[PDB]
Write a protein that binds this ligand. Sequence first.
Ligand SMILES: Clc1cc(C[NH2+]CCc2nc3ccccc3[nH]2)cc(Cl)c1-c1ccccc1
Ligand SMILES: Clc1cc(C[NH2+]CCc2nc3ccccc3[nH]2)cc(Cl)c1-c1ccccc1
Length: 327
Amino acid sequence: GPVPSRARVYTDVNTHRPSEYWDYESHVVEWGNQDDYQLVRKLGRGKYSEVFEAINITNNEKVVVKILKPVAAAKIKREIKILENLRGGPNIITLADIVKDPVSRTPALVFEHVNNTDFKQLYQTLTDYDIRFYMYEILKALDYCHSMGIMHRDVKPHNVMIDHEHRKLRLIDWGLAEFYHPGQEYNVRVASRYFKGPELLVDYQMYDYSLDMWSLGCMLASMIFRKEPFFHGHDNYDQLVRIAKVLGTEDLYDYIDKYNIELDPRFNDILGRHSRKRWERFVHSENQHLVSPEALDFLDKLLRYDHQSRLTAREAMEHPYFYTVVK
Ligand SMILES: Clc1cc(C[NH2+]CCc2nc3ccccc3[nH]2)cc(Cl)c1-c1ccccc1
Ligand SMILES: Clc1cc(C[NH2+]CCc2nc3ccccc3[nH]2)cc(Cl)c1-c1ccccc1
């Protein structure tokens, strides 16, 4: 059978918590009043939810209303409990209220308003300094939720809101987040295909907070190399092939051997044989202004097959890549 694995940090935080902290199924939802909110304009959407900017008429303040589709609505108690537990933490979106539509019985989560800068403009115009600055802000949110015994499990640009004028960042969409319990085998059908870690792709269920660090590494590689997404897999099997074409197959087989992971019968025919590529292969005239030896060393320490070898969020914050960032 597969070799078990534990996180190397924050391993027992949930064991020392009262059951109410992590037993989200026992949580009783105190529903607020939907009539407190006037929906003004659509901000965005997804396969799980529709997002609107609204006014809370009881205080005349702007809020964000996230209407959950049935898929997201099914695990709403987990999302609520995680949001309530992390509320007040650094760069964590603040849940303000929980409402239910009496006509469709659909629930909605109400959040603090973020004056988001257009996502395309941010991807296109962020400077070398800004990338480092915002990466450090994400690491604050990740180290906080990991220290609180939660993995986000869906880290990507679409789940980060930036108010570029106020240099304010919020990690959002906690719908796929889970409590980390050592030895627990989780569902690998988490995150988004481009950001899925090798543990998910090889069906290694005993994963941990380190999955978020792989996804962070995918975000970073896309940003600095100007390649959206960095690992462009057609499906979950091809996703591992795209990763193997960069990290190489030798370190992949060393990874599976270490954890005694069993792959699909055609593994040799699908994966083939690939050398580990030098990061400089991805450096071109249009991206050289975002690349440095520090950025490459940092990326190298996030994008590792072995989930246990990746930098933790707190180690990542000590990296020389952030020495230029004003703290
Ligand atoms: Cl972290 C980040 C976030 C962004 C901006 N995302 C917008 C996400 C979003 N989802 C929404 C859902 C409903 C409504 C509005 C929404 N806005 C861009 C960029 Cl380029 C980065 C970035 C990437 C790498 C390094 C530094 C920054
Ligand atoms: Cl047949 C099988 C499939 C599985 C299912 N995970 C597939 C992991 C995987 N992802 C890939 C991506 C690209 C390429 C190959 C991939 N392989 C598990 C197991 Cl345990 C077995 C198994 C194997 C031998 C003996 C007993 C069971």
